[PDB]
Design a protein around this motif. Sequence first.
Motif, short mmCIF file in Angstrom:
data_model
loop_
_atom_site.label_atom_id
_atom_site.label_comp_id
_atom_site.label_asym_id
_atom_site.label_seq_id
_atom_site.Cartn_x
_atom_site.Cartn_y
_atom_site.Cartn_z
N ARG A 25 -6.48 7.21 -2.85
CA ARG A 25 -6.75 5.79 -3.05
C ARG A 25 -7.92 5.44 -2.15
N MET B 15 -1.24 -5.08 2.19
CA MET B 15 -2.59 -5.62 2.14
C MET B 15 -2.41 -7.13 2.14
N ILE C 20 5.58 -5.53 12.48
CA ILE C 20 5.48 -4.72 13.69
C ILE C 20 4.00 -4.54 14.02
N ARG C 21 3.15 -4.82 13.04
CA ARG C 21 1.70 -4.76 13.21
C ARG C 21 1.07 -5.86 12.36
N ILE D 192 0.86 -1.17 0.00
CA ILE D 192 0.00 0.00 0.00
C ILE D 192 0.91 1.23 0.00
N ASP D 193 1.88 1.24 0.90
CA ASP D 193 2.85 2.33 0.95
C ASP D 193 4.13 1.79 1.56
N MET D 194 5.23 2.49 1.34
CA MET D 194 6.50 2.07 1.90
C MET D 194 7.41 3.27 2.06
N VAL E 79 1.90 -4.31 8.88
CA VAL E 79 2.98 -3.36 8.69
C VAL E 79 4.26 -4.04 9.14
N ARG F 130 -6.26 -8.10 7.65
CA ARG F 130 -6.42 -7.46 6.35
C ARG F 130 -5.20 -6.58 6.00
N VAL F 131 -4.60 -5.96 7.01
CA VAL F 131 -3.44 -5.11 6.80
C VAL F 131 -2.34 -5.40 7.81
N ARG G 270 8.88 -3.91 9.15
CA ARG G 270 10.10 -3.12 9.07
C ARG G 270 11.05 -4.00 8.31
N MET G 271 11.84 -3.41 7.43
CA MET G 271 12.78 -4.21 6.66
C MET G 271 14.19 -3.63 6.80
N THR H 112 10.07 0.53 5.91
CA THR H 112 8.86 0.29 6.67
C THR H 112 7.78 0.23 5.62
N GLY H 113 7.00 -0.84 5.62
CA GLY H 113 5.95 -0.95 4.63
C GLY H 113 4.62 -1.41 5.19
N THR H 114 3.56 -0.91 4.58
CA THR H 114 2.20 -1.26 4.94
C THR H 114 1.65 -2.13 3.81
N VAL I 146 6.64 5.91 -0.98
CA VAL I 146 5.94 5.62 -2.21
C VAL I 146 4.52 5.22 -1.81
#
Lengths: 153, 153, 153, 153
Positions: D123, A151, A122-123, A100-102, A130, A127-128, A132-133, A147-149, B104
């Motif tokens: 979005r 789906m 981390i979460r 979704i975002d990063m 999050v 459905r969603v 950390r990479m 850090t990415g969120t 992003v």
Amino acid sequence: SNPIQAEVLKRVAEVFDQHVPFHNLLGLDIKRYDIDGVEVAINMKPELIGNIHQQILHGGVTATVLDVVGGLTAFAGLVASRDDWTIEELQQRLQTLGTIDMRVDYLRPGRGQIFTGTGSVIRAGNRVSVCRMELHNEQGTHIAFGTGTYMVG
Amino acid sequence: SNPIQAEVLKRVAEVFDQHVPFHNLLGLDIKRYDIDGVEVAINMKPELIGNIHQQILHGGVTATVLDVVGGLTAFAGLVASRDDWTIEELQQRLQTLGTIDMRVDYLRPGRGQIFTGTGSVIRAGNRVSVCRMELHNEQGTHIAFGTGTYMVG
Amino acid sequence: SNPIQAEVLKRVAEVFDQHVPFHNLLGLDIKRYDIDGVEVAINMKPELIGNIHQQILHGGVTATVLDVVGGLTAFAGLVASRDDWTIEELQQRLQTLGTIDMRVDYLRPGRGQIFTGTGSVIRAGNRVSVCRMELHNEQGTHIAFGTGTYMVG
Amino acid sequence: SNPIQAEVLKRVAEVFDQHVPFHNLLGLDIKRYDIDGVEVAINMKPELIGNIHQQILHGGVTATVLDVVGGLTAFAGLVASRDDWTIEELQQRLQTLGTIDMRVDYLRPGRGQIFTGTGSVIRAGNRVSVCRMELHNEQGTHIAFGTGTYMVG
């Protein structure tokens, strides 16, 4: 673990590993993949350079590797969260999986022979999720954090 | 733009469009680059696919394009901010030019034949600049938005 | 630590701890501040609730706390940067200290009587620093994580 | 907007404008709220100052406003996405509304008498929405931009 949880963990790992064209163009390999943490490595090659003078990895490669580590980490988290997972149940999920975002934080110049990325949720969500990479070279030096969120359902 | 500004931009443009290994690997081109901003174009091709079934761009390519758009947008703004730059100072700036952090936002599935990225400076600095980036296919639909923080001095 | 460094860190601390109106309105306190980092704390009170139907901390408080922790962490890292700072030099820097961008990741609803925040530098710099921040409840679990890019000169 | 949509919106606007302790502590106001989006305003008062000398708004306030604008923007986009919405069907949705992550870009010092915030959905989704927020002062000068990922289902 669960017989089915094993299938997907050895399948999904292989899907990302070679079933993705861009992953093959870069030479990206998902070394392992299991209930806890996934691993993604990439060998340095002339084609991945950005600044020829500094001979450093192009920031896009760093971003790509972190994004891949996260999605895999997220999906792996979804898998381990249940024991009732059917095959089609997870197949529908894998088709839904997406970023979704990063956010990427570039820490040091991308120099090295081999680069490895790992992550953690981390979460955890149904459905969603999050995560950390992190990306480091063979000497263990941290090149970038992410850090990415994602789906997952 | 004066001679200096124009010449630096023409030089930087061919560097990014022809002498960057990762850009050549993906087919990333600088369609337009002047004192007003940049335009980056990238043609779809099999090796850039992320998921074969949906035939969509790998999130990595998108991130790469957005990042390059931001860097160049931030550099163009830097060049445009002063009437007294010298070739040597700007050449030193081009070497320090780099991404500190970037976010992003993936809006829609990356389907398209040709993808185009553009950007704008939302915060201009002599040392740090923040840019907003956008990526769209040939139909003009926005695939992703980006926001980048760049070291420019 | 060094006489001057410990002296400057001491000064900066009472500043955020009492010389900031918004901090007094929220009850934000600088529990401790040394060359190693910082630890901020804030007691729960009726005025900080976001959703009364859930008696949870308002996200705005979380973001505020993470950002302060980040700026203090950044400046601390800068103090420890050199071993020959002049009290005037560091005073000039403190005047330029500021947040460029920040990302907050919300992990759990904030509950409990006291919230504590800490952080660390992931990228040290003379002009710009990037920090990670964390906020947690009295039971030790993380309410949110933060990543911030700061101007330190 | 049909009657149901406008009814839940008016109800939601009321809760955020008077029944949110933290908004009442800061003086955050929902100037207008309809299916188009939201307008949030907050007058400058001594208690909201971050830097006494510069008389600038504390970054935490800016982040608080941007997050709230984003949440309401996200919820309005959800309300306008369907017609089959039943009163409680949307009230159950409001219970799930929350911020997953947020990025704030601080463009320039928060000076001004009255700060106003608006946003938009970049979005729209049935479970997750991404939004862009913006804060300016009474002269129209942009103070900060934001981007938020919200849970709407």
